[PDB]
Amino acid sequence: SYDIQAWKKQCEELLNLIFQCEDSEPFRQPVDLLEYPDYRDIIDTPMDFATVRETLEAGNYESPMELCKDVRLIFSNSKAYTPSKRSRIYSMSLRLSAFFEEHISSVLSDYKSALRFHKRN
Numbered sequence: 001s002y003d004i005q006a007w008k009k010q011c012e013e014l015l016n017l018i019f020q021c022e023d024s025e026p027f028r029q030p031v032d033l034l035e036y037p038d039y040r041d042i043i044d045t046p047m048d049f050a051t052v053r054e055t056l057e058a059g060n061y062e063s064p065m066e067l068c069k070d071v072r073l074i075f076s077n078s079k080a081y082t083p084s085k086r087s088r089i090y091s092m093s094l095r096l097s098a099f100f101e102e103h104i105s106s107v108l109s110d111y112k113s114a115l116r117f118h119k120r121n
Ligand SMILES: COCCNC(=O)N1CCN(C(=O)c2cccs2)CC1
Pocket: 025, 026, 027, 028, 029, 030, 031, 032, 035, 036, 077, 078, 079, 081, 082, 083, 087, 089, 090
């Protein structure tokens, strides 16, 4: 299954599955500072799923590993901001992270396999 470009549409599909999840509700767009005045005291590099989709659709990811690093940053930002491990929004992040990781694993494997096949000779 050696298509080097297949990851992109697979990532567009998994973003659609994430935008149909109620658990993505907090992570679709940026944190408003009026609501969270200290957010940028704690979080150096904001990230949200609309920004990930924009970066993909513009052609500014070279690999699904780059997309995966930004999605992971959405979840580490929630872990760094939460004042408790049992907050609503951090709890939503952990379920959404599990869903993401379950679905991205074959996208990554298939892409890495395709590059190795390309380089074989
Ligand atoms: C509806 O969503 C609006 C945009 N998102 C947003 O305001 N936030 C998600 C990122 N945040 C967090 O993960 C945490 C908050 C409380 C604990 S963690 C901080 C608030």
